[PDB]
Amino acid sequence: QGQPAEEIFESVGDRELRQVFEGQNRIHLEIKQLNRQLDMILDEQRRYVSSL
Amino acid sequence: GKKNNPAIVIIGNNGQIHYDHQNDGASQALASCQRDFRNKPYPVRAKITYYQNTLTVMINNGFTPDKNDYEFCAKVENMIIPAQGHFGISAATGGLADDHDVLS
């Protein structure tokens, strides 16, 4: 299989901002949930306005 | 090789299931949540909740200093365990190196 040594090496400052970048990914899924939650709200009342 | 890891794997064994680590125990995996838990600014906190025979896992990410910011990722129901048993913690380090440090 073999294992390269590039995987081991890191700079701490970059790894910290990598965690920050990983922290931004939470907001993405939060936005994605918010969009789909807004999308389903718009569609159901569109049926509800027409049904009314 | 399935990019599941880092992940938290719930496996309940009666003593007859061999844990194969080559698939990282995905075959005998009762439940799992694919979440990174290494290299966090704050220590990672987890909530393990066996209650009414369901085993609920709630995790604090360690990206916040809040202790109670627990988030559900996976669980099982109708879980069977020896009601008399020993709680234990264990960690392994392979060729690649981690420091597994448990604060509380």
Curated annotation (Swiss-Prot), chain A:
Q: Where in the cell is it found?
A: Endoplasmic reticulum-Golgi intermediate compartment membrane; Golgi apparatus membrane; Endoplasmic reticulum membrane
Post-translation changes: The N-terminal may be partly blocked.
Q: Could you tell me the superkingdom of the organism this chain comes from?
A: Eukaryota
What does the record say about tissue specificity? Ubiquitous.
Functional note: Mannose-specific lectin. May recognize sugar residues of glycoproteins, glycolipids, or glycosylphosphatidyl inositol anchors and may be involved in the sorting or recycling of proteins, lipids, or both. The LMAN1-MCFD2 complex forms a specific cargo receptor for the ER-to-Golgi transport of selected proteins.
Clinical note on disease = Factor V and factor VIII combined deficiency 1: A blood coagulation disorder characterized by bleeding symptoms similar to those in hemophilia or parahemophilia, that are caused by single deficiency of FV or FVIII, respectively. The most common symptoms are epistaxis, menorrhagia, and excessive bleeding during or after trauma. Plasma levels of coagulation factors V and VIII are in the range of 5 to 30% of normal.
Known partners and oligomeric status: Exists both as a covalent disulfide-linked homohexamer, and a complex of three disulfide-linked dimers non-covalently kept together. Interacts with MCFD2. May interact with TMEM115. Interacts with RAB3GAP1 and RAB3GAP2. Interacts with UBXN6. Interacts with SERPINA1/alpha1-antitrypsin. Interacts with BET1.
Name of the protein in question = Protein ERGIC-53
Organism encoding this protein: Homo sapiens (Human)
Q: What is the lineage of its organism?
A: Eukaryota, Metazoa, Chordata, Craniata, Vertebrata
First and last residue shown, out of the full length, are 315 to 366 of 510
